[PDB]
Amino acid sequence: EPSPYVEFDRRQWRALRMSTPLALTEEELVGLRGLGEQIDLLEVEEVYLPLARLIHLQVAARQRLFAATAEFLGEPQQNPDRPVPFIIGVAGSVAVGKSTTARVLQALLARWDHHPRVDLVTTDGFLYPNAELQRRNLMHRKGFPESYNRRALMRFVTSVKSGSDYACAPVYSHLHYDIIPGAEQVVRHPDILILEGLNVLQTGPTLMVSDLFDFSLYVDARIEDIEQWYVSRFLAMRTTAFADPESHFHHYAAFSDSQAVVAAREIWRTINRPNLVENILPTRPRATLVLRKDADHSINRLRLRKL
Amino acid sequence: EPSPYVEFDRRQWRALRMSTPLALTEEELVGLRGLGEQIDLLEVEEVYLPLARLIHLQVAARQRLFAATAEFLGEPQQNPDRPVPFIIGVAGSVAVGKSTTARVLQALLARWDHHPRVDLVTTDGFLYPNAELQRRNLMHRKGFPESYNRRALMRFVTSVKSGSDYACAPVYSHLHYDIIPGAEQVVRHPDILILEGLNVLQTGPTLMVSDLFDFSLYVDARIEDIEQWYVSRFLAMRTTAFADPESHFHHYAAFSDSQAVVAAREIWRTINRPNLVENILPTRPRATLVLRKDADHSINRLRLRKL
Numbered sequence: 001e002p003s004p005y006v007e008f009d010r011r012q013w014r015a016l017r018m019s020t021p022l023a024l025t026e027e028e029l030v031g032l033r034g035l036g037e038q039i040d041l042l043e044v045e046e047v048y049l050p051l052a053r054l055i056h057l058q059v060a061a062r063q064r065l066f067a068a069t070a071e072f073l074g075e076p077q078q079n080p081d082r083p084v085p086f087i088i089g090v091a092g093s094v095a096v097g098k099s100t101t102a103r104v105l106q107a108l109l110a111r112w113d114h115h116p117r118v119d120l121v122t123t124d125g126f127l128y129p130n131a132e133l134q135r136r137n138l139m140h141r142k143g144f145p146e147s148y149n150r151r152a153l154m155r156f157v158t159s160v161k162s163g164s165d166y167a168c169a170p171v172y173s174h175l176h177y178d179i180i181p182g183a184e185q186v187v188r189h190p191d192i193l194i195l196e197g198l199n200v201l202q203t204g205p206t207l208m209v210s211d212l213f214d215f216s217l218y219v220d221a222r223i224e225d226i227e228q229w230y231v232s233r234f235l236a237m238r239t240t241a242f243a244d245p246e247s248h249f250h251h252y253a254a255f256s257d258s259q260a261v262v263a264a265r266e267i268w269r270t271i272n273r274p275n276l277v278e279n280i281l282p283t284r285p286r287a288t289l290v291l292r293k294d295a296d297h298s299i300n301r302l303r304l305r306k307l
Numbered sequence: 308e309p310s311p312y313v314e315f316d317r318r319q320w321r322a323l324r325m326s327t328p329l330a331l332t333e334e335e336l337v338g339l340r341g342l343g344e345q346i347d348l349l350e351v352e353e354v355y356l357p358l359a360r361l362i363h364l365q366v367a368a369r370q371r372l373f374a375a376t377a378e379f380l381g382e383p384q385q386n387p388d389r390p391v392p393f394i395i396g397v398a399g400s401v402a403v404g405k406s407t408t409a410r411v412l413q414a415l416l417a418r419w420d421h422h423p424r425v426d427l428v429t430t431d432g433f434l435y436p437n438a439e440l441q442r443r444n445l446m447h448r449k450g451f452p453e454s455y456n457r458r459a460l461m462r463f464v465t466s467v468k469s470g471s472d473y474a475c476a477p478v479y480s481h482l483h484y485d486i487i488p489g490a491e492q493v494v495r496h497p498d499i500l501i502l503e504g505l506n507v508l509q510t511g512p513t514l515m516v517s518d519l520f521d522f523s524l525y526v527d528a529r530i531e532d533i534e535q536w537y538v539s540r541f542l543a544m545r546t547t548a549f550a551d552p553e554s555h556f557h558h559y560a561a562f563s564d565s566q567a568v569v570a571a572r573e574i575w576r577t578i579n580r581p582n583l584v585e586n587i588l589p590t591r592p593r594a595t596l597v598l599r600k601d602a603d604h605s606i607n608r609l610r611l612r613k614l
């Protein structure tokens with residue numbers, strides 16, 4: 001029967017790359033990928049290039065219908081480029097590779113002829129401070145929708161897409177596990193803004209940032225493989241991030257493989273799995289494009305929304 | 308601060324009419340309006356004409372971005388006109404005038420040069436049969452989201468927008484208060500499809516018809532005035548619809564003004580008000596355009612979504 005989606009295997013999807021030129025070195029790609037991730041230039045060629053093409057086709061088009069409303073409203077046509085910013089949402093579970101996906105994507109789009117100003121903002125900066133989470137009793141629901149200042153977030157994206165010259169976002173420290181006092185990420189009328197986070201695709205009784213997305217990605221994989229990736233990476237960090245004496249999780253650095261597995265498995269089932277099942281996965285149906293990864297992190301399937 | 312919306316008063320909105328020609332007689336308009344409604348040609352000139360213009364500007368534009376995805380996919384350009392159907396959602400409370408709004412709109416759009424095939428479908432046809440509602444114990448939640456076969460509904464709209472040649476919808480009898488056995492409304496690849504219903508703008512954990520709307524209307528008024536309109540019309544029907552011996556509500560025809568008011572007030576607070584507050588109003592933020600009516604049914608304010 002009819003469907004709003006059209007599935008692709010990697011063979012079918014890579015052919016849609018066309019002439020899209022690869023503007024990324026092997027060394028540039030590594031400073032973009034996170035611990036555990038297996039993304040290489042082949043994947044950036046057979047997957048991210050078609051995606052970048054599809055995106056560029058729609059930036060021009062998306063611009064046409066904001067112009068229709070401008071024409072209808074008896075309005076000018078504000079400086080070119082200073083068209084309406086194209087907002088892209090990248091969602092998915094913790095440890096699924098979505099932040100790398102978002103970084104790679106910002107890289108590819110920034111290297112487009114025109115030379116678009118492409119900004120990337122993670123929702124981390126929009127988490128409530130630990131003190132405020134403690135107050136609302138949310139220190140163990142960090143990542144759940146309620147642990148974010150969604151008002152501020154919505155104001156931020158609304159501000160950018162409405163044409164503001166500059167919008168500020170708080171900044172989150174992973175080293176300190178908390179929001180950084182005084183820190184701000186300033187976004188200045190970018191041509192494209194990618195917003196990456198766990199629940200960005202969420203919907204509700206009020207207008208949310210998902211309602212401002214012109215395009216969205218949902219990096220998917222089966223729950224069991226993601227837990228494995230999460231646990232694996234938790235263990236690997238004992239010698240990277242947790243090794244830092246200043247790390248809020250420095251006590252984990254000394255855990256044994258077995259002790260670390262138990263700890264990582266517990267956080268997964270008490271925080272990350274529940275959030276994935278209750279809040280993140282239910283948003284997957286609305287994503288313009290879903291990137292399905294196999295147990296080895298390899299993106300071998302895609303689901304696109306034609307309707 | 309920045310906003311996704313831009314408010315208008317009738318003076319500001321009527322000026323956006325431009326050259327839009329009025330193709331509707333006074334007599335045509337009456338066979339389109341419901342009991343109690345006060346819509347006249349002036350309102351169709353100062354309100355529905357700008358709306359029809361704005362809509363036409365976007366049908367062309369909306370077409371551009373379905374073409375981008377076609378271009379990207381290495382596809383042809385299917386027969387012209389046989390472009391992708393433009394889906395319009397019209398929501399709002401029972402008795403707010405939304406069905407008239409939808410009928411007037413279908414009329415105005417059908418009379419556009421090209422001569423678009425403009426179909427209108429009410430979600431009534433998608434209510435579960437009384438027998439099935441009795442089974443799920445829903446005979447008094449008729450109108451609530453759960454009293455509708457949303458799967459079938461979604462399949463219907465998906466079918467039409469995906470390019471099907473014909474799609475069928477069940478038919479609801481207001482005379483008999485139930486779905487009509489064997490009846491079907493056949494929709495054949497229209498250029499525009501207007502879907503009118505209480506919860507059409509609803510959102511959820513699955514892709515819904517609201518996600519297929521290219522444009523949506525939400526006819527609004529303050530809850531107190533709508534109850535008044537509902538009650539008033541309930542009383543007026545004693546001599547129109549309830550007067551019919553075959554009417555499922557023929558017992559109401561003999562009620563006294565006071566008896567009828569008590570009955571109408573009870574249905575309003577036990578079914579229609581709760582549904583309006585819990586399910587319909589929460590969808591209002593997402594409507595492309597909101598038509599705000601004053602206590603006298605007069606549309607004197609509009610809220611448009613620019614973002």
Ligand SMILES: CC(C)(CO)[C@H](O)C(=O)NCCCO
Nearest residue numbers: 094124142143198267271272
């Ligand atoms: C969502 C995020 C990862 C943001 O940093 C948050 O810190 C979190 O998930 N806390 C519980 C442990 C997850 O590793």
Ligand SMILES: CC(C)(CO)[C@H](O)C(=O)NCCCO
Nearest residue numbers: 401431449450505574578579
């Ligand atoms: C929603 C609809 C009006 C559809 O006909 C439904 O019959 C209903 O609202 N029943 C309760 C009484 C409302 O008058």
Ligand code: NA
Nearest residue numbers: 033034035099
């Ligand atoms: Na990382």
Ligand code: NA
Nearest residue numbers: 152153155156
């Ligand atoms: Na903000």
Ligand code: NA
Nearest residue numbers: 340341342406
């Ligand atoms: Na009517």
Ligand code: NA
Nearest residue numbers: 459460462463
């Ligand atoms: Na159906």
